Amino acid sequence: LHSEIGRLNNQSLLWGPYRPNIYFGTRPRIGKSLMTGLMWGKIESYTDFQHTVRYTCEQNEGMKGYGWDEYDPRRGGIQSIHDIQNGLDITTSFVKIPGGAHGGSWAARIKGTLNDDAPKDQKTIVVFYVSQEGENSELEAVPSENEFGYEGDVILKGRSEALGNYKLVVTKGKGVIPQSDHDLSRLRGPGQTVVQSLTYPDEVLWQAKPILFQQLKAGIDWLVENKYDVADPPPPWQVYLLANKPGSGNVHIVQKVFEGDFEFDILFSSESAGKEVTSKDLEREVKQATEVFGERFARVFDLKAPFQGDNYKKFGKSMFSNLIGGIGYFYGHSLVDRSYAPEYDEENEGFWEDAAEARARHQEALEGPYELFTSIPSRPFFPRGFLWDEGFHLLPIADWDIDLALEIIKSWYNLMDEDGWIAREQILGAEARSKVPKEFQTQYPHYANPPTLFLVLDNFVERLRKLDETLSTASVDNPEVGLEYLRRLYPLLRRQFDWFRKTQAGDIKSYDREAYSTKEAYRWRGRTVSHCLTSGLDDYPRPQPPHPGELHVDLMSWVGVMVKSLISIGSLLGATEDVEFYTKVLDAIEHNLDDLHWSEKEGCYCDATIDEFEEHKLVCHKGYISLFPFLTGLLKPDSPKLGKLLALIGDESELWSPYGLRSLSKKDEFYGTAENYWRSPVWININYLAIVQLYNIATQDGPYKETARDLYTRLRKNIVETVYRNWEETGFAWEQYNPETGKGQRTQHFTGWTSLVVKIMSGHH
Numbered sequence: 001l002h003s004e005i006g007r008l009n010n011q012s013l014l015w016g017p018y019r020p021n022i023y024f025g026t027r028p029r030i031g032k033s034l035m036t037g038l039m040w041g042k043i044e045s046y047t048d049f050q051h052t053v054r055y056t057c058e059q060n061e062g063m064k065g066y067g068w069d070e071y072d073p074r075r076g077g078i079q080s081i082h083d084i085q086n087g088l089d090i091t092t093s094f095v096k097i098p099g100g101a102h103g104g105s106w107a108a109r110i111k112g113t114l115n116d117d118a119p120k121d122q123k124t125i126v127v128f129y130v131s132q133e134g135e136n137s138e139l140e141a142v143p144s145e146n147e148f149g150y151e152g153d154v155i156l157k158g159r160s161e162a163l164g165n166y167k168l169v170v171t172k173g174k175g176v177i178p179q180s181d182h183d184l185s186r187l188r189g190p191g192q193t194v195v196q197s198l199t200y201p202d203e204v205l206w207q208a209k210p211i212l213f214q215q216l217k218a219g220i221d222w223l224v225e226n227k228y229d230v231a232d233p234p235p236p237w238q239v240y241l242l243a244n245k246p247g248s249g250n251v252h253i254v255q256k257v258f259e260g261d262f263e264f265d266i267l268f269s270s271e272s273a274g275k276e277v278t279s280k281d282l283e284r285e286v287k288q289a290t291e292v293f294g295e296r297f298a299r300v301f302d303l304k305a306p307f308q309g310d311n312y313k314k315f316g317k318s319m320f321s322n323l324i325g326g327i328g329y330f331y332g333h334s335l336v337d338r339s340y341a342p343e344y345d346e347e348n349e350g351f352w353e354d355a356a357e358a359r360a361r362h363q364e365a366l367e368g369p370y371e372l373f374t375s376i377p378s379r380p381f382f383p384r385g386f387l388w389d390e391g392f393h394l395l396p397i398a399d400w401d402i403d404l405a406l407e408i409i410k411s412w413y414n415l416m417d418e419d420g421w422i423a424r425e426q427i428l429g430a431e432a433r434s435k436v437p438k439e440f441q442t443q444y445p446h447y448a449n450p451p452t453l454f455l456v457l458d459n460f461v462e463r464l465r466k467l468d469e470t471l472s473t474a475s476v477d478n479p480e481v482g483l484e485y486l487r488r489l490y491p492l493l494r495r496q497f498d499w500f501r502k503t504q505a506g507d508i509k510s511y512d513r514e515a516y517s518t519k520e521a522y523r524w525r526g527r528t529v530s531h532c533l534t535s536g537l538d539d540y541p542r543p544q545p546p547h548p549g550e551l552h553v554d555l556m557s558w559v560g561v562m563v564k565s566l567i568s569i570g571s572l573l574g575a576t577e578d579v580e581f582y583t584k585v586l587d588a589i590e591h592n593l594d595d596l597h598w599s600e601k602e603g604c605y606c607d608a609t610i611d612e613f614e615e616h617k618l619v620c621h622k623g624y625i626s627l628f629p630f631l632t633g634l635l636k637p638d639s640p641k642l643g644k645l646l647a648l649i650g651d652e653s654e655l656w657s658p659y660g661l662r663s664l665s666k667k668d669e670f671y672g673t674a675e676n677y678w679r680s681p682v683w684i685n686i687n688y689l690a691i692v693q694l695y696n697i698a699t700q701d702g703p704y705k706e707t708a709r710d711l712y713t714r715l716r717k718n719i720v721e722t723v724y725r726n727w728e729e730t731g732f733a734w735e736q737y738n739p740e741t742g743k744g745q746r747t748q749h750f751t752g753w754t755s756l757v758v759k760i761m762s763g764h765h
């Protein structure tokens with residue numbers, strides 16, 4: 001039954017609009033296969049189109065906003081794009097029709113509506129770009145009945161091992177096609193849908209904008225040769241219409257020009273299913289998907305008081321839809337330093353200078369290929385998997401579709417190398433690499449990242465202990481399936497546990513350090529003077545200088561999160577020799593948290609270092625770090641230490657803003673300093689952890705239950721209203737929120753862990 005549900009998830013999920021890096025295109029979960037993409041651009045002049053044309057997601061003064069109104073990766077959804085520069089509001093409805101043996105069929109409708117400020121007679125160039133990768137695969141444009149191009153539909157017939165036989169139809173569409181009076185109409189026609197079928201070496205098929213422009217340029221060059229000039233030039237929209245040349249190729253450019261409003265359909269028919277897909281089919285199965293997205297959302301995300309309002313329901317569907325609509329499939333080579341230099345051991349004082357030397361050896365090699373199906377922080381800025389980001393992305397996605405979340409976790413853990421390392425940033429392939437400056441591309445097998453995926457796995461276990469509809473929950477509804485998932489994954493869970501303890505080890509036994517345990521101390525590898533990137537809290541203030549002495553309280557707390565899941569899972573699998581080792585290490589961490597990290601002076605947990613005179617010195621920087629034992633669910637609900645932490649959270653003068661918890665205390669000396677990334681601003685992912693933990697303490701007998709109810713109630717409201725107010729006035733989820741004003745700052749379209757806000761509103765944790 002496990003392998004049965006396996007094949008059915010494969011078949012349910014294969015197709016999707018899995019290129020979140022571009023405004024609109026589709027690819028299946030297959031490295032070398034069929035890919036599509038949408039480009040559009042107003043043409044007002046002979047030189048403007050190269051500047052106006054749209055393909056890969058950006059965010060500037062040109063673009064008001066864009067994202068999914070609804071989306072389910074299994075069914076599809078609707079995206080709206082609000083383009084100021086091109087005077088255009090576009091809709092991209094996308095829908096999957098299950099059937100046959102090759103992962104179903106699909107269809108899309110592209111509707112452009114000119115906005116009020118746009119010329120009523122604007123000419124918009126639109127392209128559907130189609131590539132196929134493979135040795136033994138074929139894609140051919142069925143030629144036109146007319147001489148110069150197509151009066152109606154464009155039929156692409158194609159085949160591969162992966163997809164079998166399929167046909168891909170770019171429909172005639174509704175809308176006015178401008179006609180040219182010029183002499184050139186005798187040779188290129190007056191204006192019609194055109195196709196160019198070409199072939200390039202597979203590894204450059206993705207570079208669609210340069211490939212398109214090479215043909216536009218070749219058509220312009222032909223004009224200049226064939227005596228067409230400024231005495232009598234054709235209209236620009238005809239200068240940029242490609243000479244029709246359909247046929248065989250691994251690249252097919254379908255080009256339309258529209259005057260005013262336009263729409264047109266894309267129809268993918270798997271021959272291995274029944275009859276081919278029609279435009280009437282698209283209209284029906286879109287409407288039916290809206291209904292299903294409708295029903296599911298009210299059940300899965302039932303927003304509790306005071307956010308049951310329709311305004312907050314709109315906001316929820318948006319924050320959710322952009323989060324789950326960011327799901328991509330990525331395929332190709334990681335850049336890695338597999339040199340494992342001695343300098344990356346970070347055992348010297350000045351280890352950061354040593355580690356700079358090793359990196360300037362430039363021994364990083366391409367390796368793979370690898371595949372990853374994952375959600376992303378940001379379509380425009382960060383369209384790729386980030387390890388600790390995905391822990392948060394999947395909290396809401398698990399609610400929606402636990403089997404989708406386990407599928408993504410499975411994809412991530414299939415990346416783990418022999419030693420137990422998963423790179424924290426997954427830049428899979430030349431396309432992925434094109435968005436990342438060379439400086440940030442190379443990964444390092446000593447660079448860790450918080451294990452937040454365990455938190456999703458924790459939530460899976462609690463759900464276990466206690467057809468699209470069917471398939472979303474199959475892995476809890478059928479307990480033996482759930483367990484076999486865990487049985488296969490468990491060894492990699494354990495391997496990762498073991499890999500932290502070997503590579504991210506703190507040094508007790510070498511220093512004037514006493515403690516209940518000589519094993520349990522951790523220090524993040526990878527840290528520079530100002531930064532500790534691998535923690536996730538890029539520029540949070542840390543012991544100066546950085547030092548092999550350091551112990552980092554957040555790291556220890558993450559190992560606590562891992563060990564508690566290991567126990568819960570292990571005990572469902574009867575890993576008895578293991579469950580005792582785990583219990584003994586949990587016991588040691590709890591004690592060693594206090595012995596190495598608790599400060600009575602300052603009334604919070606702290607990082608540690610080693611002094612100019614070689615004693616163990618606590619370094620206290622009131623903020624997110626200071627709370628970590630609490631945020632990770634590690635403190636008993638009666639603890640005095642929890643109590644002092646609850647004071648620190650609630651105190652306006654330290655951490656408590658009207659807009660949520662500050663990264664760092666206004667009293668701390670590093671408040672608002674340097675890049676001020678994690679040194680004041682409000683971050684929804686760490687606030688979400690506090691909100692969850694406060695609700696735990698609040699629905700329980702103990703001394704703090706009543707405080708924790710005021711703080712939960714208030715923080716939930718402060719976080720949600722800040723993200724909501726900013727969504728209302730700017731159309732965006734933001735990476736972080738200003739502690740002084742509540743304004744969204746840094747990067748837009750951060751969905752992204754800012755979408756955690758849907759689950760905050762939903763409550764009943």
Ligand SMILES: O=[N+]([O-])c1cc(N2[C@@H]3CC[C@H]2COC3)ccc1NCc1ccc(CN2C[C@H](O)[C@@H](O)[C@H](O)[C@H]2CO)cc1
Pocket residue numbers: 377381382386388389435436437440536537538
């Ligand atoms: O360093 N840069 O200025 C940089 C710049 C550019 N670009 C391109 C190209 C230029 C430039 C400007 O546009 C695009 C591209 C990358 C970087 N790399 C840094 C970087 C990496 C990830 C994150 C997102 N967050 C930050 C969270 O703290 C972290 O916990 C969370 O893990 C993470 C993942 O979502 C943020 C910053």
